[PDB]
C-alpha cells in the first residue's frame, strides 16, 4: 500500500543538489515522483518479460542489464 511515498522530500532536494539546482518549487517533488513511477514501470515490465521468458521465479542482474540494453541506456557495472 502506497510505497511510492517512500521517497522523502529531502531526498529529491539532494538529487536536485546533484543537478545544480538552487531554489526548488513545491510541485517538483510530486512531478519527479510521478516520472519515477512511470520509469520503474517502463523498466520493471521488460525485466519481468525476460524473467518469464527465461523460466525463472527470481530476477537477476543480467535481466536488468539486458532489459536496459534494448532501450539504449546500456547500464554498466553490476551484471555486465
Amino acid at each position: 500500500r502506497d510505497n511510492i511515498q517512500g521517497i522523502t522530500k529531502p531526498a529529491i532536494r539532494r538529487l536536485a543538489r546533484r543537478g545544480g539546482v538552487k531554489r526548488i518549487s513545491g510541485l517538483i517533488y510530486e512531478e519527479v515522483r510521478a516520472v519515477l513511477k512511470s520509469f520503474l514501470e517502463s523498466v520493471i515490465r521488460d525485466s519481468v518479460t525476460y524473467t518469464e521468458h527465461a523460466k525463472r521465479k527470481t530476477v537477476t542482474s543480467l535481466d536488468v542489464v539486458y532489459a536496459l540494453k534494448r532501450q539504449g541506456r546500456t547500464l554498466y557495472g553490476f551484471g555486465g
Binding site: 546500456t74 557495472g77 555486465g80
Partner: protein, 91 residues
Amino acid sequence: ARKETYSSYIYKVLKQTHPDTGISQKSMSILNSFVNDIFERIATEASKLAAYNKKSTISAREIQTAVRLILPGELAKHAVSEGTRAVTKYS
C-alpha cells in the same frame, strides 16, 4: 564452473603503458563491459555491411570500413593505421 575475461590482458597492457598504477576490480569489470560492447558493435556493423554487399564472407575490408564509419576520424584513422600495420606485418 569457468568464465572468460580480459583481466590478464588489461593488466599486461597496463604494464606496457604505466607499470606502476594498479586497477580496481570494479573498473576492470567496466573495461570488460566496454570491450565486450565494442566487440558486438564492430561485429554487428560488419554483419550488416556484409549483408549490404550480398556477400557471405567477412574480411578485413569490412572491419576496416566499418571501423572507419563507426568511429571518429581520429580513432578510425589511428585504428586503421595500426590495424593495417599489424595485419600487413602478420601476413
